[PDB]
Amino acid sequence: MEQALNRVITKIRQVSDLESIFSTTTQEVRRLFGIERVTIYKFREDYFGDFITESEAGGWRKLVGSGWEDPYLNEHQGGRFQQNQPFVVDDIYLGETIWEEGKFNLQKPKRPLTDCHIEALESFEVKSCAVVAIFQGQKLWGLLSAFQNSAPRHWDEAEVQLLMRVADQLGVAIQQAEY
Numbered sequence: 001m002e003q004a005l006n007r008v009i010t011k012i013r014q015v016s017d018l019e020s021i022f023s024t025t026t027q028e029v030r031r032l033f034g035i036e037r038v039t040i041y042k043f044r045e046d047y048f049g050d051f052i053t054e055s056e057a058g059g060w061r062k063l064v065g066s067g068w069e070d071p072y073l074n075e076h077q078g079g080r081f082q083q084n085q086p087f088v089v090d091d092i093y094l095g096e097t098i099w100e101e102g103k104f105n106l107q108k109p110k111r112p113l114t115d116c117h118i119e120a121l122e123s124f125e126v127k128s129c130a131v132v133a134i135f136q137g138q139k140l141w142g143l144l145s146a147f148q149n150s151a152p153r154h155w156d157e158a159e160v161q162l163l164m165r166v167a168d169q170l171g172v173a174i175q176q177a178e179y
């Protein structure tokens with residue numbers, strides 16, 4: 001995915017302001033994956049959070065402006081994202097792909113999601129999600145999410161790695177904007 005990644009990084013750096021960087025990033029990732037939504041979501045201080053930027057295809061509701069107050073992320077102060085672990089779900093009704101030592105554990109069955117988590121995803125029209133941390137330095141800033149809304153979609157580990165590198169670029173841009 002390095003060629004795809006290099007293309008994404010090129011587009012990101014061809015604009016100046018952070019808002020253009022966010023919009024270009026969500027657009028380029030959505031096009032690359034051929035999916036229906038990519039979002040940038042910013043954590044509040046309590047690890048609730050709000051949708052900041054999105055790219056959508058297929059006539060879905062706009063999520064920007066809206067919040068997601070996830071009680072699990074609040075109680076665990078960001079959950080697995082503090083360790084920069086991704087959350088990878090082909091099908092929200094079947095569960096997550098286990099990620100260990102920076103790759104899929106193909107020996108483990110998928111782990112079903114808790115029903116209120118599933119219901120929250122349904123409220124955002126999501127049927128499949130690959131979610132990775134955006135770090136500003138070593139500070140967990142938010143999440144970059146790739147979504148499919150109309151159907152499940154299989155995520156492979158090269159796509160998850162790409163998403164994490166794109167989130168790295170976002171984090172560097174956020175860090176440099178805060179500088």
Ligand SMILES: *[C@@H](C)C1=C(C)C(=O)N/C1=C\c1[nH]c(/C=C2N=C(/C=C3\NC(=O)C(CC)=C3C)C(C)=C\2CCC(=O)O)c(CCC(=O)O)c1C
Pocket residue numbers: 039041049068069070071072073078079080081087112113114115116117118120129131143145
């Ligand atoms: C019921 C307690 C409940 C409500 C209501 C709710 O909104 N969430 C609830 C429970 C719950 N959530 C999780 C774990 C995660 N929630 C995540 C949320 C996001 N995904 C995104 O793409 C975005 C940005 C738009 C989110 C804010 C994520 C990524 C979760 C996994 C985190 C982790 O593993 O550490 C859980 C635990 C997992 C589960 O059992 O389903 C629960 C119980």
